[PDB]
Each structure stands twice: as C-alpha cells, then as structure tokens.
Design an enzyme around this catalytic site. Sequence first.
Site, PDB file in Angstrom:
ATOM      1  N   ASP A  19      20.291  33.136  37.400  1.00 31.94           N
ATOM      2  CA  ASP A  19      19.308  34.748  37.355  1.00 31.94           C
ATOM      3  C   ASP A  19      18.405  34.188  36.040  1.00 31.94           C
ATOM      4  O   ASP A  19      18.824  35.606  35.087  1.00 31.94           O
ATOM      5  CB  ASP A  19      19.986  35.601  37.768  1.00 31.94           C
ATOM      6  CG  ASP A  19      20.428  36.062  38.992  1.00 31.94           C
ATOM      7  OD1 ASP A  19      20.027  34.562  40.402  1.00 31.94           O
ATOM      8  OD2 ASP A  19      22.050  36.471  39.166  1.00 31.94           O
ATOM      9  N   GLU A 230      13.289  40.840  45.151  1.00 30.21           N
ATOM     10  CA  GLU A 230      14.158  41.170  43.806  1.00 30.21           C
ATOM     11  C   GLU A 230      13.376  40.340  42.584  1.00 30.21           C
ATOM     12  O   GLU A 230      12.214  40.159  42.651  1.00 30.21           O
ATOM     13  CB  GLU A 230      15.181  41.316  44.388  1.00 30.21           C
ATOM     14  CG  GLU A 230      15.487  39.574  44.487  1.00 30.21           C
ATOM     15  CD  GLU A 230      17.498  39.569  44.845  1.00 30.21           C
ATOM     16  OE1 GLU A 230      18.342  39.878  43.319  1.00 30.21           O
ATOM     17  OE2 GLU A 230      17.666  38.748  45.185  1.00 30.21           O
TER      18      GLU A 230
HETATM   19 CA   LIG Z   1      15.511  38.564  36.338  1.00 27.07          CA
END
Ligand SMILES: [Ca+2]
Length: 331
Positions: A19, A230
């Site tokens: 991430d 997301e």
């Molecule tokens: Ca991110």
Amino acid sequence: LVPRGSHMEPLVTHIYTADPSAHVFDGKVYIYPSHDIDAGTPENDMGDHFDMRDYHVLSMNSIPGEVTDHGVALDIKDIPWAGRQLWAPDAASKDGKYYLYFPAKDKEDIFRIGVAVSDSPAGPFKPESEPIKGSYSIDPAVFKDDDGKYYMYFGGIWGGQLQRWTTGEYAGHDASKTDLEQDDAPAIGPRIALMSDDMLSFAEPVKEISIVDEQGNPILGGDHDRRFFEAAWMHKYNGTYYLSYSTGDTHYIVYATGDNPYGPFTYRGVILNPVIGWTNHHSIVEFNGKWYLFYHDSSLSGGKTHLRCIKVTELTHNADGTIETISPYIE
Ligand SMILES: [Ca+2]
Ligand code: NA
C-alpha cells in the site's frame, strides 16, 4: 546497503510491505506503506487476514537507490483509540511538521482514520488520542493542491465498510459486507474533505465524489471493472486532477480525470493491470521531473495475498493527459 528499484524488483525484502504512499520531502522520496506480517488470522472477504500492527517509514535518495528502513514509526499498542488493523497509510507535510494518516478499527470494530505527528518525515509519530471526527472507512490519501489547500480522499468497500455509511451513521456489523447491492444504481463513490489548518480535522462536511463514464453517466454498482473499490489517490498533470483507485475484485488500478478536487471525475482507463496476489494498491509521484508508480505484489512471499512487497516503475503521461497502461510483468 545496496541500490534497489531498477527492474521492478522488490524495494525491500527484510520485511513485507504494501500500500505504498510515496512523497518527496526534503528532496528525498519517503514511502509510507503498510507493514505486512504473517499473523495467521483467518482469511476472508472482510480482510481479517490483513492484521498489521505497525508502520515503518522508508526513504530513497534516488530511484534506483538504497532504501532506508527508519524502524517502527507508529505501533498500534500506542494508539489509544485503536483496536486492530493498521491498514494503508499516507503522510503530509505542513509548516515543518509531518502528519501520518492511518486507517484502523476502533474498539467497536469500526474503521476510522487517525493522525499522528512528528517533526521529521521519518517519524516516529505521536498519535492523537481519538480518530478524526467524522472520519470513517479506510485508505486515506492526503493531497496538497497547488493553492496550499490539503484534501483527504478516503474510503473502501467490502472490508473497508464504506457501504455501511450511507446515512452518516454506521449501519451496524450485520449490514452489507460488500456494496449497496443495487448493481443498476450508481456505484458508491470515494470521500473527500478539505483539511483544517492544523491538519488534525476536517474543515467541512465530508463530500462524496461522482465518477462517470465518457458519456457522462454514473459508473454503476454492477460495473466492477471501473467502479471504486478502495485506494484513492490524487495527483495533478497539466492542471487536470487525476483520481486513481483500485477496483478490488477485478484487480485494476484505474484513473479518472476532473477539473477540481471534488470532481466529478470522468473514467479514462487503466493505470496498472492485475498483479500477483489479490490486492492492488498504489501511488503516483513526480521525483526529479519523472513520474513513478509505486505499487505492490505478492511475488516475494510466493503468492500469499497478505504478505506483499512494494515495487516501483516509471509512469508515462501523454501530453493530452492520457496515461499509458502499465502491465506489471512484461518488459
Ligand atoms: Ca493509499
Ligand atoms: Na489505457
């Protein structure tokens, strides 16, 4: 201490990383990733197998270059409001302070977004005792616009719980595990709020972003190839605003363009095709005049979705504002 990031190899191997949120602070690249661990928790679509407990900040002086791991910048045991799951973070810089924004479940098992503060981009960071008021769900991106205004983009469906916030109050743990469950309606949109001057709160009621197709029609709930899942990220090119994001179960990073922070954004195409492992999560950053895509995959762990490694590659904009799609395992 050896240089990394020349042929899409893992940037670090001594820990698992995911991430990646990349920034240029003090003329260096600072990366704010999740720190994956083999927690051995049950695997499922609500993401219990992602049971991360701390953050390490990484930095590079060049790409390729040596990657410095600055240690534990924030530990979940020291965040008073947090119960579990330190998911995809981001950072920002204002007036000589550095702010780490992080999603985590509170003690009622509801994802909120918190902030932690340091005098250095490398941390460590002191968490605020409570999460940001009015925050919810996951995957913050805090974007500094050219006019000096900072905006938090956020949200994630399925395990990120965004589908349970339709009314501004949590719909409960028995509510939808996925989305609105109305595939012919417009899909759920990511969230945005202008940040306060002190960077610890939102300066307005949270807004929801419209994402439309090339004909101006809303992307629908059933359109899993294009609809927001997301990993919202914002960058600018040619004065145009680029909302990029993960599509989740179809495993793409895609992008959409607009003329201001709030959108609407018009879906354009794919940034990154699917990687090894289920999740796909990224950031896009300019460093010394070149644009880079930071992303991850499950290559280092031999394909375990919850044990990832971050990577980087050059990203090519065309002058008309389109971006060349990256396929991760070709060149
Ligand atoms: Ca991110
Ligand atoms: Na494309």
